[PDB]
Amino acid sequence: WVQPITAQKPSLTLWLDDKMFTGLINTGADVTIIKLEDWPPNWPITDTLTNLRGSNNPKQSSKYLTWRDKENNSGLIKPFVIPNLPVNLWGRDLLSQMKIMMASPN
């Protein structure tokens, strides 16, 4: 698949375990973030002593989540779960497993 970068939000829709999520492609971030409002209440989260330069000691998924795209590619991520975010943010942890590259005509 191909997605030009424009003024519009670059987005991907995929599954984490059994649930569909939509998020912003976020090359700027090492790690994936799910906004607390999209986080399934029954899925366990845990404190971390990680710090995110961009929210200190954020929550993270207790378990690894199986990501799956619409072509049935899959892998594991363990996202951070952050309160008061407008959008999910797909980081380079996920993007790299989907073998996504950036290219210019030139």
Add this chain to the structure above:
Amino acid sequence: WVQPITAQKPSLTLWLDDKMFTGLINTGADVTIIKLEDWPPNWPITDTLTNLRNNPKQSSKYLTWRDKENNSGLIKPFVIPNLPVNLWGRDLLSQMKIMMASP
């Protein structure tokens, strides 16, 4: 050019007017941000009443961006203290006609 996305910071080096800057490709941002620490003191910046999710400074002028293949255009970045890296937003990336692709 082609750059796989990996754990390493995806970076671009280019000119804004006469000066070289290096930064992180930041698809998540509408607008480009330059570290106040890298910002030439003689280049004017202005208050805004915009918030970036606050009241940040922005370049008073449009800056001519130029890459190493001599593609060019205009951006007007925000200028923010206390960031570790410059951040290339979609204002710049869209003018460079950058695509994301997967095998």
Add this chain to the structure above:
Amino acid sequence: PYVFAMT
């Protein structure tokens, strides 16, 4: 404008 970086 929304600005989504972090180590």
